[PDB]
């Protein structure tokens, strides 16, 4: 929860605005309250016994998801260390044979055991992710869809842009019986019906949301107490195919789940060919935070880097055109006089030669192509070489390196800005620490006691758990504003100390 809080603070400070700051804070509080529910569920305390064992196993996997992920990295590293001993020979231990070459002889059985363990651990990692992290994804998706339905009328008054795939995919879940499975508001359908039932039509709203108006009345009329047996056939009947399809679409369109699926696919391929286990060594980027930041330095300006590579390609193409038109004679790369190997007798070969050799050469294409001394085009060709060296070897590679360095600087600046914003300004009211510090340790006291965001989250948890009939006046006030999604109760540019400055002094 502390890591989530730090990430949320970084996000709001770096990217968020002031107008939506409190809304994002409340969204973070709702997500955290769900994460605490999931953590509480997974916390450690023949069909019935099988179900109990399944629940225990899934809870264990959810608890040890990160440990399983580190074990996967360790197993991949061990497998690759063993792979380092492979040798290729013509004779078995015309086709070439690959085989381990070690004196002990324990490596090959060890290699097989480690590969099987790695595949098992990858499968367990996928299951643990599905049981631990996917629920928050579904919760956030359902919450956003519910808010858009109720307050924006996304499928009632408006329609999806038809370029946003999320909105189009969300049409599947609207009429499903189990729409708010993870989201707390199980009455969102009726709230939407009441809000938009008059203008857009109650029957049409019911058709859109898969609602039964007679059932709406009968449920309030009297209670219903079904007691289905916990049988496999009953479970299969209870499955909601459309909702499951929507959920699977959401999951498969998730980056982390996709990464884990690719991990498992590569682990399976490793049994086809052991060297496919080398791909799993790329998991260090995701695992180690330091490497993640180092690679974020590169990926910060990835678009600019790719555009720079394209510009380099275009410039090399222009140089290739000039060389093909004028400097063909200098591109013979065969020492033998009888057989000349002319790289620039055709445009495609000349372009490949340039892009492949001149760019990689320290001094440019002139390091490779023939010396121009004593030639009628000597000055033209030395200008050609010098311009190639300066524009391609010097400036463009300098552009790439400068992009990387600027990415480093920008990321450091972002972190420093977040730290300074949190140290000098209050998160809730936004008043600067200079005003508070008039009193000794004023800012510290204000941010630890008066305006603690942790205290605000604890208030929401307290308001949800407390019975409504027991709510005090202020508690009922804040509760109504939370239910109406109005964030005016949050103090903005004001505080108790500023309100009662003269009296308090």
Partner 1 sequence: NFLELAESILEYFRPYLGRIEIMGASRRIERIYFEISETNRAQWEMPQ
Ligand X SMILES: Cn1c(=O)c2c(ncn2C)n(C)c1=O
Rg of the chain on CA atoms, in Å: 32
Q: Nearest Cα to 146, choosing from 212, 61, 231, 209?
A: 209
Size of the site for partner 1 (CB under 8 A): 9
Q: Which of 164, 213, 432, 477 binds a copy of itself (CB under 8 A)?
A: 432
- Distance, in Å, from the CA atom of 48 to the CA atom of 51, rounded to the nearest integer, reads 5
Any contact of residue 431 with partner 1 (CB under 8 A)? no
- Whether the CB-CB separation of 346 and 336 falls below 8 Å is answered with no
DSSP 8-state assignment for residue 468: G
Mask of contacts with partner 1, 457-496, x by CB under 8 A? Answer: x---------------------------------------
Q: Which CB, 380 or 489, lies closer to Zn ion?
A: 489
Mask of contacts with ligand PCW, 278-307, x by CB under 6 A? Answer: xx----------------------------
- Distance, in Å, from the CA atom of 16 to the CA atom of 174, rounded to the nearest integer, reads 30
Rounded least distance, CB 173 to partner 1, Å = 32
- Distance, in Å, from the CA atom of 352 to the CA atom of 344, rounded to the nearest integer, reads 9
Q: Which of 453, 460, 463, 492 binds ligand ATP (CB under 6 A)?
A: 453
| Residue 231 half-sphere exposure toward CB, CA atoms < 13 A | 6
**Of 26-34, 175-183, 209-217, 446-454, which part binds partner 1 (CB under 8 A)?**
446-454
- Whether the CB-CB separation of 98 and 86 falls below 8 Å is answered with yes
Compute the residue count for the chain.
505
Q: Which of residues 453-472 bind Ca ion (CB under 5 A)?
A: 469
Rounded least distance, CB 29 to ligand ATP, Å = 13
Mask of contacts with ligand PCW, 384-423, x by CB under 6 A? Answer: x--x---x--------------------------------
Any contact of residue 418 with ligand ATP (CB under 6 A)? no
Any contact of residue 89 with ligand PCW (CB under 6 A)? no
293 is in an annotated binding site: no
Residue 387 binding partner per list ligand X, ligand PCW, ligand ATP, none, with a CB distance cut-off of 5 to 8 Å that depends on partner kind = ligand PCW
Enumerate the H helices of 425-472 as residue ranges.
Answer: 433-436, 442-445, 453-465
Any contact of residue 457 with ligand ATP (CB under 6 A)? no
**Of 158-166, 315-323, 357-365, 422-430, which part binds ligand ATP (CB under 6 A)?**
422-430
Rounded least distance, CB 376 to a copy of itself, Å = 15
Q: Which of residues 262-281 bind ligand PCW (CB under 6 A)?
A: 269, 272-273, 275-276, 278-279
- Distance, in Å, from the CA atom of 22 to the CA atom of 456, rounded to the nearest integer, reads 11
Q: Which of residues 166-225 bind ligand ATP (CB under 6 A)?
A: none
5 is in an annotated binding site: yes
- Distance, in Å, from the CA atom of 58 to the CA atom of 35, rounded to the nearest integer, reads 16
112 is in an annotated binding site: no
Q: Which CB, 52 or 448, lies closer to partner 1?
A: 448
Would you state the structure tokens that stand for residue 497, as one six-digit string? 């100390």
Task: For residue 422, count CB atoms less than 10 angstroms from its CB and return exposed for 0-12, middle for 13-18, buried for 19 or more.
Answer: middle
- Distance, in Å, from the CA atom of 201 to the CA atom of 192, rounded to the nearest integer, reads 11
Any contact of residue 124 with Zn ion (CB under 5 A)? no
Rounded least distance, CB 473 to Ca ion, Å = 9
Q: Nearest Cα to 430, choosing from 490, 493, 496?
A: 493
Q: Which of 426, 456, 478, 482 binds Zn ion (CB under 5 A)?
A: 426
Pairing of strands 97-100, 86-89: antiparallel
Any contact of residue 308 with a copy of itself (CB under 8 A)? yes
Phi and psi, residue 80, nearest 5°: -70, -35
Q: Nearest Cα to 57, choosing from 116, 134, 123?
A: 123
**Of 102-110, 395-403, 444-452, 463-471, which part binds partner 1 (CB under 8 A)?**
444-452
Type and span of the H or E element at 315 = helix 302-326
Q: Which CB, 184 or 435, lies closer to Zn ion?
A: 435
Phi and psi, residue 87, nearest 5°: -135, 155
Q: Which of 171, 441, 466, 485 binds a copy of itself (CB under 8 A)?
A: 441
CA distances from residue 488 to 23, 266, 331, 449, 472 in whole angstroms, order as listed: 11, 52, 75, 20, 18
- Whether the CB-CB separation of 442 and 448 falls below 8 Å is answered with no
Helix, strand, coil distribution of the chain in percent, nearest 5 = 70, 0, 30
Q: Which of residues 343-382 bind ligand PCW (CB under 6 A)?
A: 380
- Distance, in Å, from the CA atom of 422 to the CA atom of 420, rounded to the nearest integer, reads 5
Q: Which of 23, 35, 367, 450 binds a copy of itself (CB under 8 A)?
A: 367
Any contact of residue 488 with a copy of itself (CB under 8 A)? yes
Q: Which of 122, 209, 428, 457 binds Zn ion (CB under 5 A)?
A: 428
Rounded least distance, CB 269 to ligand PCW, Å = 6
Task: For residue 82, count CB atoms less than 10 angstroms from its CB and return exposed for 0-12, middle for 13-18, buried for 19 or more.
Answer: buried
Any contact of residue 445 with partner 1 (CB under 8 A)? no
Binding site for partner 1 (CB under 8 A): 429, 449-452, 454-457
Q: Which residues are annotated as a binding site?
A: 2-6, 184, 422-427, 447-453, 469
Which residues lie near ligand ATP (CB under 6 A)? 2, 5-6, 422-423, 426-428, 447, 451-453
Residues placed in the known binding site for caffeine: 184
What residue numbers does the annotated binding site for ATP cover? 2-6, 422-427, 447-453
> Which positions touch Zn ion (CB under 5 A)?
426, 428-429, 451
């Amino acid at each position: 929860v502390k890591e989530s809080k730090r990430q949320f603070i970084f996000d709001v400070v770096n990217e968020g605005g002031e107008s939506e700051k409190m809304e994002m804070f409340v969204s973070f509080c709702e997500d955290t309250i769900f994460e605490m529910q999931i953590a509480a569920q997974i916390s450690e305390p023949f069909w019935g016994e099988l179900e109990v064992q399944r629940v225990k196993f899934l809870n264990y996997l959810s608890r040890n998801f990160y440990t399983l992920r580190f074990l996967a990295l360790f197993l991949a590293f061990a497998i690759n260390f063993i792979l380092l001993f492979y040798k290729v020979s013509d004779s078995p231990p015309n086709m070439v044979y690959y085989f381990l070459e070690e004196s002990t002889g324990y490596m090959e059985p060890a290699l097989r055991c480690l590969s099987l363990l790695h595949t098992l651990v990858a499968f367990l990692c996928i299951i643990g992710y599905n049981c631990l992290k996917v629920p928050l994804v579904i919760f956030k998706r359902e919450k956003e869809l519910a808010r858009k339905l109720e307050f924006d009328g996304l499928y009632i008054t408006e329609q999806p842009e038809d370029d946003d795939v999320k909105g189009q995919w969300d049409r599947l879940v609207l009429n499903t019986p189990s729409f708010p499975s993870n989201y707390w508001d199980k009455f969102v359908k009726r709230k939407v019906l009441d809000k938009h039932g008059d203008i857009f039509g109650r029957e049409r709203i019911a058709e859109l949301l898969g609602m039964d108006l007679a059932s709406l009345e009968i449920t309030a009329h009297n209670e219903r107490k079904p007691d289905p047996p916990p049988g496999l056939l009953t479970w299969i009947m209870s499955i909601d195919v459309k909702y499951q399809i929507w959920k699977f679409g959401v999951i498969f369109t998730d980056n982390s789940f996709l990464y884990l699926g690719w991990y498992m696919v590569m682990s399976l391929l490793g049994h086809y060919n052991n060297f496919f286990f080398a791909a799993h060594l790329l998991d260090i980027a995701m695992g180690v935070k330091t490497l993640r930041t180092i690679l974020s330095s590169v990926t910060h300006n990835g678009k600019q880097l790719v555009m720079t590579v394209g510009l380099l390609a275009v410039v090399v193409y222009l140089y290739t055109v000039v060389a093909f038109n004028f400097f063909r004679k200098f591109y013979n790369k065969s020492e033998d006089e009888d057989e000349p190997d002319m790289k620039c007798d055709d445009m495609m070969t000349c372009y490949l030669f340039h892009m492949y050799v001149g760019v990689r050469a320290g001094g440019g294409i002139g390091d490779e192509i023939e010396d121009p001394a004593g030639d009628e085009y000597e000055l033209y060709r030395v200008v050609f070489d010098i311009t190639f060296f300066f524009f391609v070897i010097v400036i463009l590679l300098a552009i790439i390196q400068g992009l990387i360095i600027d990415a480093f600087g920008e990321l450091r600046d972002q972190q420093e800005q977040v730290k300074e914003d949190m140290e000098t300004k209050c998160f809730i009211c936004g008043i600067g620490s200079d005003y508070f510090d008039t009193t000794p340790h004023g800012f510290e006291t204000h941010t630890l006691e008066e305006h603690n965001l942790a205290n605000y989250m604890f208030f929401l948890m307290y308001l949800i758990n407390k019975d409504e009939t027991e709510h005090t006046g202020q508690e009922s006030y804040v509760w109504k504003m939370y239910q109406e999604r109005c964030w005016d109760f949050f103090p903005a540019g004001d505080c108790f100390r500023k309100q009662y400055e003269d009296q308090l002094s």
